[PDB]
Design a protein around this ligand. Structure first.
Ligand SMILES: *[C@@H]1O[C@H](CO[C@@H]2O[C@@H](C)[C@@H](O)[C@@H](O)[C@@H]2O)[C@@H](O[C@@H]2O[C@H](CO)[C@@H](O)[C@H](O)[C@H]2NC(C)=O)[C@H](O)[C@H]1NC(C)=O
Lengths: 217, 197, 208, 217, 208, 202
């Protein structure tokens, strides 16, 4: 059976150019199929980029048309994608796929698909987080905001690991800046506030950040 | 100047096979690579070739413009069996009428030959692959095509099976009209040919 | 050309689920459907409105009529839990639907706990303002978050995580609204709205 | 004998589609007859909708032509009606009928007919009635106006059924709003007004609403 | 194409009644007739101008000439009381006449009492205004209702019931003019005109 | 070149019986011959006068061509389209022979017809016409309005006058109209008029 395989740089600076190629196995580029690129930003839908025929003819998504180029190499049995002037919005898993035409009417279907390759557009480099208290408003929620760090991971404990029960450290969000942020929350009895001390311990090893923050009402 | 066909059959050239303005006569030889791009048959073929070998002049004219179908889709009916530039297409000289917004109103259309010459007119019927394709393309489950001339009365029912098209032709005399009526599966003429014996 | 899908549906094991896809005159177009599991490529389950590729179980079926195409999965199994996308073609372009997360119910429904924090005074002293909305303990793992400022919808400055499975097999998510200190004080009310299985939970803070 | 039987949803929301089928027994759809749809709004005349032949040939009422479709299913020996984009004007009893041609000239006659099926076009859902007095001005008429309820029926009595003579409860009208209205009237001696108390007892079971209203001068 | 009929005719038991149907060039067309009783389907009584279906009694006959077709019932019985419709075909369409109610007189003629109610104060406070025109104790069971506002005819907002039999065997009908309070107050006078057997009864109300 | 009929008789095809299923895509023929025991003869019940003589003539001719001599639209005082029968169906509805016209009354009237056609061709013309004998007196009035009617047809070689016998049938006639010879029709009812005729050689 036919298999497709993407390859190319996984990290690209902003305003740079994503450059990928798709190797075709078990089948020939010179055939009645169309060869397509599709991308998927993390946690989002599939977006069609464009397509090419062995003859060189192309069709592109009108929204990407100005900055996108697709080419084909028949002797090497591959086709390729060039996406220039990239920003954080261009961070996505990029797929190649084979497209077959319907027996009747317009359009067609995608099969098989490549395994996909993640391309990240970010200028971010090692950066330590800022740590802010999230003050509470028969239980109460309080926490720590760990903001703008890179790379992962960050670890958070409470009262140096003496407090585990009721602790939830949420997975981080990756902002469009290229930097991560996360929050840790501990749910405590409302009456304990003011008698009991709550301290979040934030650690980011890549920046040698060790920050303790007391959270009070 | 005589039309000497290469690689393409008379049938293929008359219908306008994508894979293929005045001429004296037309001759096809031999065992052409391209006959009918969409699978099918051309009725009374040998009889037509016999007729077409005796004509002094041959000229293509538009009798029913593609744009005149406002209630039907005249362009999106296409097949990968008839490709053009890598994508689906169809015969250039006849129209694959299909439903528009899931509706196919009954067609009643007449063309009267006011020329001074006989006209060769061609049309076809699509016999769909199965019942699902029938409703996909034409919406109407139960369909017919009626064709009439002062000398001709034809009524066709699509055989639903493997899909094929079946093409027919007649000579429309001057001052005689051809009348088409269909609620589906009609491959309509756009262009016809003035012929002179 | 747009193809609209419900963001999520859920179904009990063995039962039937419908995933719908709508668009103008969609019934004139051939529609295909893709199944996608986390970390894997899309997989074609239906093409040309109704056809099943080789190796695709008979319980997958599709139909298309009017303006709506439907992927139907009967006797749904656990392995059918996935994202599903419809696909069509319009005017020189291929179009994929917005996608539907299909959950095969393996545990009881659980409503989200929602906690909303205003910017801390310390962040405000650093000339930044972040509103933090934390969402936990919900099943199924699909949620829609909407921010309001003075009752009006807010889009700019919003970042939200994809739901992730907790240790108790329920799900969590977080949403951040990043503002300038000036923008924070410019409004009298802010709200984080979390919609889960047709029910909307709301938390509000105000700039004292 | 040939018998025809209509079936389909009895309630359709505005802009929706009336969808009916006619089952033919005692005869085959494939015959020399035409198969027809005719409708009758309540209390009004007959209107021809359209017709179909086993060959697929159809003819429709020109005023309905854009929104009507009639089809035939030979294997199930039935034919069907689809009327789209409906409004309040499309509320009617819908009949199917068999049409036979004259030996000479155009047209034909309808026989037999189906039993008819009422289709109501309303956006309404279950709703209780409002009850308003119809106050009197050698006899006088007084009553109750039972307004804006859904669906039918409503029953009305007077003085808990103790008052019958001179009482008439009218059939309901379906207002353009999609809600029903009816009136109940009792004709009484003029001198009895002000001495005798008149109370209408309204029952709307579908909404489980029960209303008692006194009507005085 | 129109087919016009008398709205109603009456006939003594044993006597003969004529129901007429008129329309342009009707004598060139074959005409059919249908009998319809309340709550029942139409029943063919005459087809192809003169022909009787099997089972239809011989006292039913029909004729057609000029622009007028006629259904004739001789020795009219109680069971003949029904609505009657003529039917023809013109150019693309089947057309039914406007219909005629035939009453076989079983009781003396009774004149309608008409009562017109203005909107009640309770309804007006509910932001609605309904004029209720009630017509009772009339025989035969055929009536025509017309609404006017400051003398000008009104169609929009009118609903009228077909006459229904009372407990005393006379007939009643009701008609409604539904208005908003604003339009109710916009005119100085409203009229309900009731025509029964060629005689018109009129009642009027005013927004005081 | 020769027209070999399948499923249909010479009478039926000449008159244009709708029930005839033929595919004839060429408008010129040498001669016309009907197979023995045709499936479709006359859709409306009736008779064809001098049939055997006509078939004999038509099988021995070198050229055969159909032309329109009297357009249906030229009858402004009579209804030329609505005269139809369920016995001659087309697409499920009543219809008639295609090559002759069933003229019927228009409004309450059927004016007397006086129509002549001169054969301006260079060939002999086969011309066909008919008379309708109605089922009863009622049908007579329904279709033609005039109780007492006739058809007159004349040629230099022919003088015909027909009165309808009033179970309904049609009766068809034909003549060969020589070049420069004219045929004269006169009728106040029951006239089945020619629309199409046939050029024959010799
Ligand atoms: C899932 O949908 C099926 C099928 O519904 C029909 O097909 C769709 C593609 C769409 O066109 C719908 O509007 C159609 O009604 C449902 O099965 C039908 O359910 C209806 C009531 O909803 C019932 O009247 C029919 O008889 C059913 N027919 C069949 C063949 O099952 C099914 O209920 C839907 N399931 C869920 C969970 O919504």
């Amino acid at each position: 059976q036919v298999q497709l395989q993407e390859s190319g740089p996984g990290l690209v600076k902003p305003s740079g150019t994503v450059s990928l190629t798709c190797a075709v196995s078990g089948g020939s580029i010179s055939s009645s199929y169309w060869w397509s690129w599709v991308r998927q930003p993390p946690g989002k839908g599939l977006e069609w980029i464009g397509e090419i025929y062995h003859s060189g003819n192309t069709n592109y998504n009108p929204s990407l048309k100005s900055r996108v180029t697709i080419s084909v190499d028949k002797s090497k049995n591959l086709f390729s994608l060039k996406l220039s002037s990239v920003t954080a919005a261009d961070t996505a898993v990029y797929y190649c796929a084979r497209v077959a035409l319907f027996d009747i009417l317009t359009g067609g279907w995608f099969d098989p698909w490549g395994q996909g390759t993640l391309v990240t557009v970010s200028s971010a480099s090692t950066k330590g987080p800022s740590v802010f208290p999230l003050a509470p408003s028969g239980t109460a929620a309080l926490g720590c905001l760990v903001k703008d760090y890179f790379p992962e991971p960050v670890t958070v404990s409470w009262n140096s690991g003496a407090l585990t029960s009721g602790v939830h450290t949420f997975p981080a969000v990756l902002q469009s800046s290229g930097l991560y942020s996360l929050s840790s929350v501990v749910t405590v009895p409302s009456s304990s506030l003011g008698t009991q001390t709550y301290i979040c311990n934030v650690n980011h090893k890549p920046s040698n950040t060790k920050v303790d923050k007391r959270v009070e009402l | 100047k005589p039309l000497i066909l290469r690689d393409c059959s008379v049938a293929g050239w008359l219908l306008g096979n994508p894979m293929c303005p005045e001429w004296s006569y037309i001759v096809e030889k031999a065992n052409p690579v391209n006959d009918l791009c969409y699978p099918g048959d051309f009725n009374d073929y040998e009889e037509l070739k016999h007729l077409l070998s005796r004509i002094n002049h041959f000229e293509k004219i538009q009798i029913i413009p593609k744009s005149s179908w406002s209630s039907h889709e005249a362009s999106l009916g296409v097949s990968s069996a008839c490709p053009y530039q890598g994508k689906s297409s169809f015969f250039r000289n006849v129209v694959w009428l299909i439903k528009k917004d899931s509706t196919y109103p009954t067609i009643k259309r007449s063309y009267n030959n006011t020329n001074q010459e006989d006209l060769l007119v061609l049309w076809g019927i699509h016999h769909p692959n199965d019942a699902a394709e029938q409703t996909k393309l034409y919406q109407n489950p139960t369909t017919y095509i009626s064709v009439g001339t002062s000398t001709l009365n034809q009524r066709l029912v699509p055989r639903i099976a493997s899909g094929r098209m079946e093409f027919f032709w007649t000579i429309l005399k001057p001052n005689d009209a051809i009348n088409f009526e269909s609620n589906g599966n009609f491959i309509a003429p756009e262009y016809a040919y003035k012929i002179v014996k | 050309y747009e193809l609209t899908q419900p963001p999520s549906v859920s179904v009990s094991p063995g039962q039937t689920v419908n995933i719908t896809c709508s668009g103008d005159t969609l019934g004139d177009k051939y529609v295909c459907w893709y199944q996608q599991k986390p970390g894997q490529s899309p997989v074609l389950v239906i093409y040309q409105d109704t056809k099943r590729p080789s190796g695709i179980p008979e319980r997958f079926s599709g139909s298309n009529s009017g303006d709506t195409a439907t992927l139907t999965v009967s006797g749904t199994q656990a392995m059918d839990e996935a994202d599903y996308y419809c696909q069509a073609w319009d005017s020189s372009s291929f179009v994929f639907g917005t996608g539907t997360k299909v959950t095969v119910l393996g545990q009881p429904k659980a409503n989200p706990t929602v906690t909303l924090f205003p910017p801390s005074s310390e962040e405000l002293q650093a000339n930044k303002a972040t509103l933090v909305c934390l969402i936990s303990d919900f099943y199924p793992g699909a949620v829609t978050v909407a921010w309001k400022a003075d009752g009006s919808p807010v889009k700019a400055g919003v970042e939200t995580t994809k739901p992730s499975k907790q240790s108790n097999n329920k799900y969590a998510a977080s949403s951040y609204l990043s503002l300038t200190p000036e923008q924070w004080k410019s409004h009298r009310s802010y709200s984080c709205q979390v919609t889960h299985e047709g029910s909307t939970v709301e938390k509000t803070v105000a700039p004292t």
